[PDB]
Amino acid sequence: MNFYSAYQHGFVRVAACTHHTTIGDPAANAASVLDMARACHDDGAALAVFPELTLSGYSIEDVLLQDSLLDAVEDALLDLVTESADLLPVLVVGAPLRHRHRIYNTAVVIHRGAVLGVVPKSYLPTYREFYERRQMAPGDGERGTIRIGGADVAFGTDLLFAASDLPGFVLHVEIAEDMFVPMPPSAEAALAGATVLANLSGSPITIGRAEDRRLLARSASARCLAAYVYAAAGEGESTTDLAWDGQTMIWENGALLAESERFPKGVRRSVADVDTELLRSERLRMGTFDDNRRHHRELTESFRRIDFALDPPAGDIGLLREVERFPFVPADPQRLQQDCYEAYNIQVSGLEQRLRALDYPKVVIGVSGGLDSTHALIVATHAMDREGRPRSDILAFALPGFKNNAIKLARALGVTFSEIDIGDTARLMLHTIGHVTFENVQAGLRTDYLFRIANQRGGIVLGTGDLSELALGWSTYGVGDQMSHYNVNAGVPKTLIQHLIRWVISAGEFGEKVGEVLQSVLDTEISEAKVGPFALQDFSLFQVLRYGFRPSKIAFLAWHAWNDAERGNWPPGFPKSERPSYSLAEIRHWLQIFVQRFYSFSQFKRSALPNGPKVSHGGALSPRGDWRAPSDMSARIWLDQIDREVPKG
Amino acid sequence: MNFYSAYQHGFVRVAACTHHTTIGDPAANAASVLDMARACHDDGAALAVFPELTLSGYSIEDVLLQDSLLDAVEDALLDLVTESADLLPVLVVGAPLRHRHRIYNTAVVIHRGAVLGVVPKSYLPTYREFYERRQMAPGDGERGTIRIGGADVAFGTDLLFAASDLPGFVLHVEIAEDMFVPMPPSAEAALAGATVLANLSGSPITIGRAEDRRLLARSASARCLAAYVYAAAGEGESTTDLAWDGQTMIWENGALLAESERFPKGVRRSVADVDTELLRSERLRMGTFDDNRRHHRELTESFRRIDFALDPPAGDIGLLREVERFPFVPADPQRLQQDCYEAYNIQVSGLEQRLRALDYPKVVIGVSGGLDSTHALIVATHAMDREGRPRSDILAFALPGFKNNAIKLARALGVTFSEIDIGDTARLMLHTIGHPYSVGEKVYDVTFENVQAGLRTDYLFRIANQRGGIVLGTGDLSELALGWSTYGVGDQMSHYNVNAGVPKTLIQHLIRWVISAGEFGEKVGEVLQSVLDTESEAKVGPFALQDFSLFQVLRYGFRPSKIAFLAWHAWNDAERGNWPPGFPKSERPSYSLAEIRHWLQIFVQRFYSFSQFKRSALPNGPKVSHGGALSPRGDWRAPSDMSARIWLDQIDREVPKG
Amino acid sequence: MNFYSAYQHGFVRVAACTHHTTIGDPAANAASVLDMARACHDDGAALAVFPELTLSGYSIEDVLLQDSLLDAVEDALLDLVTESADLLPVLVVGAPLRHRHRIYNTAVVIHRGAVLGVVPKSYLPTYREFYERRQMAPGDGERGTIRIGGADVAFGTDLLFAASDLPGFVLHVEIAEDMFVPMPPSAEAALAGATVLANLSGSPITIGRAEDRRLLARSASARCLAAYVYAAAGEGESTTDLAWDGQTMIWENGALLAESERFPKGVRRSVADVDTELLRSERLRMGTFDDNRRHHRELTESFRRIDFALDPPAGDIGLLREVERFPFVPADPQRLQQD
Ligand SMILES: Nc1ncnc2c1ncn2[C@@H]1O[C@H](COP(=O)(O)OP(=O)(O)OC[C@H]2O[C@@H]([n+]3cccc(C(=O)O)c3)[C@H](O)[C@@H]2O)[C@@H](O)[C@H]1O
Ligand SMILES: Nc1ncnc2c1ncn2[C@@H]1O[C@H](COP(=O)(O)OP(=O)(O)OC[C@H]2O[C@@H]([n+]3cccc(C(=O)O)c3)[C@H](O)[C@@H]2O)[C@@H](O)[C@H]1O
Ligand SMILES: Nc1ncnc2c1ncn2[C@@H]1O[C@H](COP(=O)(O)OP(=O)(O)OP(=O)(O)O)[C@@H](O)[C@H]1O
Ligand SMILES: Nc1ncnc2c1ncn2[C@@H]1O[C@H](COP(=O)(O)OP(=O)(O)OP(=O)(O)O)[C@@H](O)[C@H]1O
Known part of the structure; x- marks a missing residue:
């Protein structure tokens, strides 16, 4: 195997981008989009989400209904799709599109030269500063296909895009207001199997609005055991009645992976490595999440699964992750x-x-x-x-x-x-x-x-x-x-x-x-003499007890955290001589001791354990609570995994 | 309260009766039924189940289609119903009855002067010695009402009869062949809430057939966490091509409570006390049973619940139970x-x-x-x-x-x-x-x-x-x-x-x-x-008594007064019941209620409050008894810091001093 | 009119209470509940929410299956209901209750001498420190009625309690884990009309858990344009494997109205005036909220609306609101x- 590769350890690299809007000028918007997508490619990103109505500009109002604007949007879309044949990531770009009688506010899922799906916004705000129903139709409950450049492609709210060579990556897309309603489309999608939830947003900025965006993107990522990837419109949108802040952020199960500068000059990207195994692990353990799905069975099995092959880069591309x-x-x-x-x-x-x-x-x-x-x-x-x-x-x-x-x-x-x-x-x-x-x-x-x-x-x-x-x-x-x-x-x-x-x-x-x-x-x-440094064994303990991560995954993580003492942060209270760095050889060595001691030798001691309180969200080790396991089991398979997967030094 | 009453401890007394058939003569069959029901009344029974087609005789074939036979059956039913105004138990009696186009093979549920419901057999065997489809219609999926003596009463396979003053007692009825098919009506009924499952049977007897009957009645009572009450036809039925054995039996969650003599001369009854709390407790604990119900939700919520008030006897009527x-x-x-x-x-x-x-x-x-x-x-x-x-x-x-x-x-x-x-x-x-011992004092701390x-x-x-x-x-x-x-x-x-x-x-x-x-x-x-x-037996009591309490608590979670009632029926009289092998006559103690009470107080205190922290950190070892083991990683998850006040109080309020 | 009266201006006064748990001793829990409820009465509260499994203690595990425990819980419930004839607020108190084949983890909605409804928890965690499925049945999709003290009362996840003389106050109740799943019962309920969302919680405490509770109660109150009233278990719960912090909080459309001391010595209450007009006004304006309802029409019209008359105090009771x-x-x- 190839041990320093984030993809081979179950990460998927995602990007939330804010481009330069040129309102009413799709070719210009597409050129900005293309240029950001190439950057994302260069970064090995699997996904790049752009702002709401990317290709036209969100703020152009009745200009959305002008034939020449809609025609130019289609022409520009087709160029993007064609350019995308040479691009690694799935591009999620916004566009006002004609379907049946109306224009829908859509996100166009684009991959390696084809359109995978087209997703319409479900809830169109028509209140305060928002007039979306005036120009655009609601997408809630639209199904079927739509015609984009001589192909019939999936259309509707019920879509899932699944990487056939990367099963931890299952993409769902919604749009702005979609995530603000009591029952968002994204929450049904996660129940159906979506793990990465994208949001393309226009989102005129206002005092306290960035907090609202955060409260909702964060709670969504937490309640849905998912990554939530969010991209708002910035410079270039019309300031006839509104201002824009260009905010982008990426959340993972409640935790901020990345965000970009607000009111930037120029374009910005948030790029992070999402841990699909973390999401996988959280879901495996929280049965009430699957329970919720079963209870909305009909709602959740009706989604349609569009497959694509990502074919991500195999080599060392670092780990964009703290x-x-x-x-x-x-x-x-x-x-x-x-x-x-x-x-x-x-x-x-x-x-x-x-x-x-x-x-x-x-x-x-x-x-x-x-x-x-x-x-x-x-x-x-x-x-x-x-x-x-x-x-x-x-x-x-x-x-x-x-x-x-x-x-x-x-x-x-x-x-x-x-x-x-x-x-x-x-x-x-x-x-x-x-x-x-x-x-x-x-x-x-x-x-x-x-x-x-x-x-x-x-x-x-x-x-x-x-x-x-x-x-x-x-x-x-x-x-x-x-x-x-x-x-x-x-x-x-x-x-x-x-x-x-x-x-x-x-x-x-x-x-x-x-x-x-x-x-x-x-x-x-x-003590640390025969069982190793507790900093390393407590690291392993958390990974195993919370997530059940395999040994090579634990070694990869520990190595990114610990190999370089100048990198990352130290909690308070470590004078400069108590800041050790560990090599892979050391991390490997102690991990072998860990899996042997933890899975095999030590359980019988925990098995008859006096009472006491759980403390850490990471877990405690009570045989009456977080850790039910056999006292008479060998650790062979874990040791063998370390042998086969983790390099010697 | 009234401590020596089986009803006040959650039992319901049920009877499976085999009467004397007089084929083709409903008045005679009804007189036999009435006489057996009065016996059941006298015994304080809440339920009396009779054989299939009781009122006509099961074996009379095309005579079932004769107007005079059907008219006589109706007349006889109405007399029973009227007689039943003075009878304690719900009577379940068989009758061929006209409805819409045909006659159905029915069981008529009768209580205190009214008909509660009429239940048609669902599956009519027409093979080997059975010709039931020739004379009778299938009941499966019939609903609605039927007209019996100027009343419209519930009719169909989806009925439940629930005692409004005795909630552990929810009766379902099926008929003979019904319990032999892969998916019997009784199994959906138990999921829906039925706890006592009745079966009226004709069941011509044959080598090995009594085994079949038992295999299925027993497995039903086990798989459905219920009592299964069964009554087959006996003497009187036609021996033109068949013989009959009059078998009756009562099962409870896989265990035989009672059965009667096969090939009896004369009528026989099986009478037993069903422990509704036992069935209650088993169901509380086996969640996969409720899971099955939810999976057949639509099938199970469609049952119709007919209420009646039993008003059982309040006093001492013994305990017809081993x-x-x-x-x-x-x-x-x-x-x-x-x-x-x-x-x-x-x-x-x-x-x-x-x-x-x-x-x-x-x-x-x-x-x-x-x-x-x-x-x-x-x-x-x-x-x-x-x-x-x-x-x-x-x-x-x-x-x-x-x-x-x-x-x-x-x-x-x-x-x-x-x-x-x-x-x-x-x-x-x-x-x-x-x-102090190290300096001499005999402080046997x-x-x-x-x-x-x-x-x-x-x-x-x-x-x-x-x-x-x-x-x-x-x-x-x-x-x-x-x-x-x-x-x-x-x-x-x-x-x-x-x-x-x-x-x-x-x-x-x-x-x-x-x-x-x-x-x-x-x-x-x-x-x-x-x-x-x-x-040591002197500080914690006789282990025979504490082991008895342990089983009740650990398996069923029975309340203290229920445990005391049970132990007293088992232990107060050394000549009564059976001793395992190995007890010479001078190791056969009897315990008074005062003793049983006294040790029970010690037990609930020590078991619910004091002792749990000792179990809480317990070395590994295997479960042995179906009653349970006490590993905090298996059968017994409980707090180490809880008082036993409510159990002690229950003993005070409910169990007589002696 | 009577101008200094909070009720006459569209406020409704709500309380989230944390009582003293005596595990395995329902009479004792009820006495604590009764006493806190009287306090809430005195404060002119319309609503008092208590912690999950109030009457038995959440943490007692297989002791939930003991007949004497379940019997005592029922007796204690009936005494509360009777005491409640003289109490102003709707009391929402937790109780393990027998229905059909099993015990459900329930919240009992009690008002002026009667039980308005009984609501079972929908999602029963059985992972990490949680073993709820072992003793208790899931409530999702239960309907019909349940028998409590010789009455048949509404039972199920689909209930709304509406004040007939105070239309801005429409109550829905869920339990603990209910609010942590992608699609919580409370979200459908708000679409159906619920304005005040109660949550009774046990919630053993853990590093960072109080943040989790907040993230989810706050986002819920915001996304659902509602008050969210939350009460967790405190002192008295078993510390065999877990500790408890007694947290209580009241949210309104994303904003904290009130919260109580964590790890208190003794009982605590959060009491606040919820502005029903504010909720009303936000909903009138955000059409996409109604749009969401229409989209889940069948889901949302199936709720059952139980009416009660609050008859709140008419005079000056201050304004428990910043x-x-x-x-x-x-x-x-x-x-x-x-x-
Ligand atoms: N799977 C299994 N199931 C049931 N029993 C098992 C068993 N494996 C071993 N055993 C038995 O357990 C015993 C071995 O375990 P144990 O007796 O605990 O001893 P063991 O873990 O071999 O040794 C304890 C070590 O921990 C160190 N120590 C001691 C005291 C305090 C601290 C501290 O830092 O706090 C550390 C000390 O240096 C010593 O070398 C043997 O008698 C063995 O037969
Ligand atoms: N809930 C709780 N959590 C944590 N600790 C708790 C506790 N409750 C008591 N403790 C502590 O535990 C201790 C009491 O328990 P423990 O130390 O075992 O002693 P204890 O139960 O007081 O006495 C044991 C008794 O059992 C009898 N015995 C002993 C040994 C063998 C046999 C036999 O023939 O099989 C019989 C013997 O007569 C003796 O009187 C005290 O220190 C008490 O403070
Ligand atoms: N000399 C001692 N006096 C009193 N108690 C002791 C003594 N040695 C050990 N103990 C008890 O047993 C426990 C375990 O002993 P151990 O030697 O592992 O503890 P430590 O001294 O805290 O750690 P370390 O050995 O890593 O310095 C102690 O926390 C203490 O409660
Ligand atoms: N005199 C002894 N010699 C060897 N082992 C003993 C002795 N006394 C106790 N033990 C050990 O401790 C256990 C518990 O002791 P205890 O005296 O309670 O056992 P017991 O004599 O079987 O019980 P009882 O006194 O009720 O007959 C024994 O089963 C044995 O393992």
């Missing part, structure tokens, strides 16, 4: 902040309800001065505060084997702190057994002690292990740190933990003295 | 044997797969000489045998605290046996924690009990890490149910629990099964026998 | 800057 290094840790500081706020409150209110139900037992927790146990202590304290419980009911324990951060924190917090040396009990145990086992004896004895103390002192044992450890099965199962009465950290991956700790510092709700210890814990604490 | 003392342990020896065979093989193959997947680790198991650990050791041994593994790869441990059966068994089996005294480690731990229980598991896990094995869990389903186990570090935890789905009441019977089969030598049998003979 | 002094000049500096 890939976060930390799926669980947003690089944008406003967002990271929001996430931390939510994580923390989730953890706390999860624990509060447990305590309420147990009529407020004491909280037993082993504190080692490590990141996980520190954060848990803080979570426990806040829980107890919010529930009006004395902090002295939290029973913290240092359990030395064979750090001072731990006693310092407990003391600053004002919980009950205690030390218990497990060493002698360990020796006694090691000897009685005739002695990994030696590490497990200590790990087990810690949990054993904590559970017995909890029995004795009327408390529950707080679990401490994080989601990343659950994922790799990095924990001692049974009698060991895997086991507890309630685990507040179970849904928090390791990459996010350090950020919650800062959040709690930065907010400063626990005094200045507490913050200093916490700061110390951080500075001191920053 | 209630097993041991929902998990069948009293019938053939059946118990089948169950044991299956339980055992399930346990074993469950463990074999785990071992295969772990590339054959050693098996570490704590053996205390108790029932659970004994049975597990056996299970382990068989697993190893079938996988061609040396028995010396099973590592059994006695773990004495502060029995010889245990070392005897391990030794006879030939596994690796070893003792480890956990007492010193325990002392060291009790002292390290500052427990729970902490003190848990230190030992915990240390056992801790040891076993460490040995497992050391010696390359997995720890076999040992706790049984009944202990999972009551949260009777030490959670976390303790006997609740393990790498694979083969006993997790086996309730305690069944364990002793698996041990005998293994003895009785004798596949492990005579020496092994003797120790096992010893374990039995040699082998 | 009115900018400068319709053309936003007071929020970020926004004014954008403009």
